[PDB]
Amino acid sequence: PTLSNITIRIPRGQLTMIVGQVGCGKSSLLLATLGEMQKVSGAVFWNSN
Ligand SMILES: Nc1ncnc2c1ncn2[C@@H]1O[C@H](COP(=O)(O)OP(=O)(O)OP(=O)(O)O)[C@@H](O)[C@H]1O
């Protein structure tokens, strides 16, 4: 695994400006959010209005 223990909840209309270092899981989360990263132990349920 290249990422774990991600516990963030964001309702709709929540502008969440992600900041971080040079290579500390910024774009990787941006891709894993869409579903392009293999998730091993994660409870994720995307839903909309
Ligand atoms: N799609 C991917 N598949 C495999 N490894 C990835 C993927 N995307 C990023 N990585 C790797 O995971 C690590 C985390 O990188 P990260 O996602 O933080 O990069 P970044 O935010 O684009 O970087 P930077 O701050 O330099 O712009 C790096 O070693 C990177 O090479």
Side-chain angles (χ1 to χ4, degrees), residues 8 10-13 15-16 20-29:
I8 49 178
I10 292 174
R12 59 205 57 88
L15 198 155
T16 316
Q21 206 55 229
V22 182
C24 285
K26 297 189 305 179
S27 67
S28 63
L29 177 55

Side-chain angles (χ1 to χ4, degrees), residues 1 16 24 26-27 33 43 46-47:
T16 316
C24 285
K26 297 189 305 179
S27 67
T33 316
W46 194 298
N47 199 12

